[PDB]
Design a binder for this molecule. Structure first.
Ligand SMILES: Cc1cc2nc3c(=O)[nH]c(=O)nc-3n(C[C@H](O)[C@H](O)[C@H](O)COP(=O)(O)OP(=O)(O)OC[C@H]3O[C@@H](n4cnc5c(N)ncnc54)[C@H](O)[C@@H]3O)c2cc1C
Ligand SMILES: Cc1cc2nc3c(=O)[nH]c(=O)nc-3n(C[C@H](O)[C@H](O)[C@H](O)COP(=O)(O)OP(=O)(O)OC[C@H]3O[C@@H](n4cnc5c(N)ncnc54)[C@H](O)[C@@H]3O)c2cc1C
Ligand SMILES: Cc1cc2nc3c(=O)[nH]c(=O)nc-3n(C[C@H](O)[C@H](O)[C@H](O)COP(=O)(O)OP(=O)(O)OC[C@H]3O[C@@H](n4cnc5c(N)ncnc54)[C@H](O)[C@@H]3O)c2cc1C
Ligand SMILES: Cc1cc2nc3c(=O)[nH]c(=O)nc-3n(C[C@H](O)[C@H](O)[C@H](O)COP(=O)(O)OP(=O)(O)OC[C@H]3O[C@@H](n4cnc5c(N)ncnc54)[C@H](O)[C@@H]3O)c2cc1C
Lengths: 390, 391, 391, 390
């Protein structure tokens, strides 16, 4: 259960979400435009960069704290939910833990001022097999020259801070995969080019784009550097996604919780056969089932949030994300069902919840990849996926 | 299994669907516009009014014949699938079976000319409890005067032939629920007004609208009349809907079958970890599960199509529609999953398949109402839904 | 997560369960005999009456403490699991909280000496509708005279302490449902008769019996009495059952956890096609699914255990029991599947796990009745089940 | 739908099942003894060896015919269901199609006289990977000498006709896997030894045993011989199991149909809260769901039954068996649930239905193996399961 302090934080997040964000969710989905007005208020209320240390102007809060807040934001608007995830977990967490003092201040100043960082890993031919990426960074003096292409970049065209993963070469000699920090300004940098938008089924208020690097010049001071090498550093950087996974799970949970509350209210108001739909036992049991799965999902995510060291344990986070994301797909569809034909109408928000929830078994590591991860832990086995793995 | 003649019919439907309709499905979803040119080609290829008797210029085909055709159309475009349903089953079937010679000719001439009839039953405050409808038909001489409002009317603003269900009153005295034929054109009729469009999650190429009746005047020769009471006639009219349900189940099935085929093809061409996704056993079993459920759904629908007398048996139809629609929701979602992030992009058709499939556990009697229907048969009892049902 | 002290308690429970109980589970299922020697060891290790206050010789532990212990016992033997539930939660909790000093001492002395109390509520014609019970308690001076019949009484013929629920009448006038304490020994009491044994699919090591009352005479000092009415007291008594439900959910979970562990171990040692079954991705994902659901169930149960005041919150308890029991039915069946044909042989414990797990969606309030309970909370309304409930 | 002739056959099977077999099912499960009395009447009513050609005294009926009959038998008693499968499909089908005139008459005379043949393939270390079997047959003159061990032999100790699969060696040179016919008599043959009984969760009325061969001498005339070789013959012999799979599916379906009918009757008779349980919508929808899955299962099996040439198409049969067996596990458990605590009692038959149904996702090819088979057809791919398959 939550501490008094956590309850206060939850209430503050709920108040902003309900009083400001909830009434914007339809228009944000309709226009597919980044809600700058909401982001400013998310910032002003202290909900961006929450886990940044107080030494750089952060609140020094926990993963659990952010998950509590994320769920409240997502209940109002899926876009605001994901904005809250990206401005608190993931790239910013990786920079916070492995970044130089300089890199941390840069990233913190941007996030605390309202930037939602973009992480740039995935490519058209490199998804679940991320290490197959072709984006490369070639050494040139005290700089690295980046060439390549990413896609489905959440925040493409609106994010300023970018964390880019690239295969690193020193004078033609492959060093491994490294991460590079760059800042998209109204002016530069030269060679960081936003590409075409990938219009999506849901969470449409955040642009997802291709992203290209044409001789993008990055100083070595903006490469995340590791003493024991890049190959070990890249795995260390990946551990940041364990936190982002729990946050993403909390967005799916928030969407589902919203749909559930709306469906339950509708069952009590809507009448057929002379009585509220709530009086029909078949629907009552559907409500019960949604409630049970939602509670389990919340427990899985909050439990995962406090596991591990700096980041959630990889297997607890994987278990919770599988569960939350599948829960959200079932709950949003069944809540839509409570509305009947009105649920199929775009003038009601139920079909949007289904569209919004659907990405969470996919993005950031698919439910399938997560199942393999969980199995590798239970079976205490490496589970190589290549033809010659065994 | 299918007859030789049915295989030919299936292949001719597939031919039109794949050569003409498939390349239009994305744009139809984008524009949300009724695909008039496609409808002309559906008509010209002989796939509208197929069960109409040959005497009025129909092909005299069976329910099974139509569901075979519908699944092929729906594999190409969900909108063309539903158009094929409404122009072959439901309202047109009710008229074909219970209509007078004059009513059948009127309806046949319109459908064979390319009209997709609209059926007008549901109201904002009367959906599952269709018997609580407030749309009213008051006898006035040899006419009935209609007042009321329907909604989610498929074809609102593009359909010409309408079949409107209303509570019938004679001198204030309720007679039962009756069905009234009218034809919308640019001239009239007076008092038939197309209301607002209800924009939808999917199958966006047919407009769904509110529909208002303001002293709409219908002659008694355009009412479907039964020699012994509307109270048994309404039940008879709703049997024509057993046929519509199998057709709608076939649309859901076609959508899912398309998604399945696309998903399977993607697994074989897409590589990660140095090999096609098809080589992963977890995905192989997902593929097997989809195939098993698709096959079952297809059997359920065809079995229902040949059941009953004039129309499919109400309970076999309900069972098949439950099964097919739930199958489609699972298969379209799982096929989308095979595509990864690309599956979430609207530049691919997988997210549309999910949106399209989702209406079929809802329209024409929800999966919940169908479960109650099937239970009433198995338990062999009336299952009243009112508070005083058992008193 | 668990406290250091709770980890020690868990490990001590595991120690007893694995070193002593695990090797007896097969034989307990074969004989269907109450495992007296095992019960003595459960007692001597301090795992009976754990929530009893220290003043009467208990350990004063929490609900969470008990569910941690119960899951360990159930992993070894379902019978020892249920024995641990009944000797820590439910009847003994009702008495501990609402009993007089005299009643608590009587009950505490019996439990700490190794007695597993029986709770006596359900009747052949009154299960889910517990409020329709026909077992009757008629006031006669300072006594109540009990007449009636219970069944599926866990511990029938071996339990000494009984807590019997009966409809209370004073001069023919119904007062509500009340709870009455009695102790069965070889001497008496007169009119308490153990009826026939109901042989069961699983958890066969505790006898389940009919129980008859024939003018069973109970002094009013052995009735659980409430300062303001049985009509609120019965509701209070049934709150003690919220605790029993979490315990029973923990038994279901322990059974499933055991089956899971055995299944996983088998996959790693069993080879077909030249390699361990563990290397097949289809089975790897089955393993992942089981783990995810087990983890959720464990969280649900522990969350419920710390909810509420004296006893777990009725709705968190209902939710957790729904989840845990359904999880166990799926996990035990799927773990059995990992064994192939060996899993169907009674010389392996997998088929027993399925049989054992299956009671937990039924006993103490079925999964259906629990769904209604949870719905009543979410919808915040009474959900009467009678024909006239809404009139 | 069924033809008039098929309906008549169905009625005749139902009449025997209901008037004779149904009242025996509890005792057969309780004693775990082979019901000789029922078998005699199954024989006398013409329900054994139904697909044997009329030239050898059979009825020349179809796979669909047998599936219709099997379901009716299984509705009365799971044991009688499996007896009907084994005396009509499987080993007897393989002998009927690939056997010599001599082998066919032998097998037909035995089955028509009431023998339930035993097929002997599986071994402790050879299950899904059946070709890994170690039972061997070594050439010796005009005979073969068999040594090895099988298990889970359905009919061990009561079956007379045995069809044994063994790895064949000619003077030490491996020839492939072949099938051998032998007949267990009260006297011989020497070296055919019934082993220990494997007591089972359900379908307890048929003994499942280990089986051993100690220098079991079989004349070459009782080996099933193929002109194009054993390696191609063994695959041909396997095709017989496609028919047995559909029959086994019909047993699972029959068990489930029985449980469903009993559950529905109980909902109408049992009252709580002043009314029949049948009036509760939650249960009504459970009934509806069972009905839908049962109908689909029946269609899948009957459709599979008429597919293929001599035997059902391997993929249609695999699809139908997966479906029927999983359907039966869900339906029997939910029907048990309708009975409440009484359902858990062994004095009612509901817990037996669950135990009986459970074997059918396992025996004769597990649901997992069948999923791989179905996938291999959809993907048009061989799906090798060995480490070096790719
Ligand atoms: C809304 C959205 C936002 C995104 N935002 C970002 C972002 O900001 N930054 C970024 O870098 N990326 C982003 N992505 C990309 C996403 O994280 C990756 O694409 C993800 O890894 C999925 O990869 P993929 O699409 O190539 O799937 P694939 O790897 O091609 O997989 C396709 C299918 O095959 C399955 N599969 C793959 N491999 C295996 C295997 N060995 N066994 C079994 N099954 C298997 C998958 O589960 C999936 O079902 C985003 C994606 C979405 C949808
Ligand atoms: C895409 C689309 C096209 C349509 N086209 C047409 C058309 O052309 N002509 C026409 O007349 N109508 C049409 N409809 C309307 C549709 O057929 C009806 O609206 C349908 O009966 C559902 O009605 P409802 O939305 O009012 O649901 P409601 O009756 O309000 O029900 C809402 C929810 O409560 C449930 N429910 C209701 N009653 C009960 C009960 N007694 N027990 C348990 N659960 C219950 C429902 O299953 C549903 O989940 C269309 C609808 C859609 C979505
Ligand atoms: C192993 C075991 C041990 C037990 N130990 C004890 C014990 O020690 N003490 C004791 O008092 N009892 C005990 N019981 C009895 C058990 O708690 C009750 O019997 C239970 O309440 C179920 O009652 P029932 O079997 O009469 O079900 P019924 O009430 O007859 O219900 C039968 C079916 O109808 C459903 N149903 C009923 N009512 C409704 C409704 N309004 N809406 C929807 N569905 C509905 C039920 O969910 C169930 O599926 C035990 C039972 C078992 C199996
Ligand atoms: C009631 C009963 C009656 C029987 N009667 C007979 C009979 O009369 N004659 C006879 O010859 N045999 C008989 N058998 C044996 C049965 O047909 C075989 O044992 C069956 O092939 C299962 O093999 P197995 O137990 O060794 O499972 P295994 O092959 O060891 O498999 C164990 C588990 O791993 C899975 N598995 C295996 N391989 C793979 C893979 N590549 N990918 C994914 N998953 C996998 C399986 O699905 C299963 O879940 C009977 C069995 C039973 C239960």
């Amino acid at each position: 259960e939550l501490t008094p302090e956590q309850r206060t934080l939850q209430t503050q997040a709920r108040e902003l979400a309900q009083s400001v964000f909830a009434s914007t969710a339809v228009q944000t989905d309709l226009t597919e435009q980044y809600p700058w007005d909401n982001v400013a208020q998310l910032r002003d209320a202290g909900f961006m960069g929450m886990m940044l240390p107080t030494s750089v102007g952060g609140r020094g809060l926990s993963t659990l704290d952010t998950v509590i807040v994320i769920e409240e934001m997502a209940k109002a608007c899926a876009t605001m939910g994901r904005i809250t995830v990206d401005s608190n977990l993931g790239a910013i967490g990786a920079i916070t833990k492995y970044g130089s003092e300089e890199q941390i201040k840069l990233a913190a100043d941007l996030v605390l001022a309202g930037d939602k960082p973009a992480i740039c890993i995935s490519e058209p031919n490199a998804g679940s097999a991320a290490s197959e990426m072709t984006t490369r960074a070639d050494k040139n003096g005290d700089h690295y020259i980046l060439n390549g292409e990413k896609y489905w970049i959440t925040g493409g065209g609106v994010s300023k801070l970018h964390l880019i993963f690239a295969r690193v070469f020193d004078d033609g000699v492959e060093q491994g995969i490294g991460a590079f920090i760059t800042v998209l300004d109204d002016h530069g940098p030269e060679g960081l080019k936003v590409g075409r938008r990938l219009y999506a089924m849901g969470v449409r208020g955040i642009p997802e784009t291709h992203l290209e690097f044409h001789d993008l010049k990055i100083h070595k001071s903006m490469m995340i550097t590791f003493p024991d090498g890049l190959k070990r550093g890249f795995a260390a950087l990946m551990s940041a996604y364990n936190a982002q996974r729990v946050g993403a799970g909390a967005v799916a949970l928030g969407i589902a919780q919203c749909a559930f509350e709306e469906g339950v209210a509708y069952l009590k108001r809507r009448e057929q056969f002379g009585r509220p739909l709530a009086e029909f036992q078949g629907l009552q049991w559907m409500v019960a089932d949604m409630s049970v799965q939602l509670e389990a999902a919340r427990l899985m995510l909050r439990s995962a949030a406090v596991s591990g060291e700096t980041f959630p344990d990889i297997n607890k986070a994987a278990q919770a994300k599988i569960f939350a994301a599948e829960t959200a797909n079932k709950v949003t569809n069944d809540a839509l069902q409570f509305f009947g034909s009105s649920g199929y109408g775009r003038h009601n928000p139920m079909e949007r919840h289904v569209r919004d929830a659907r990405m969470f078994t996919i993005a950031g590591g698919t439910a399938q990849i997560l199942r393999t991860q969980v199995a590798s832990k239970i079976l205490d086995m490496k589970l190589p996926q290549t033809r010659d793995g065994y």
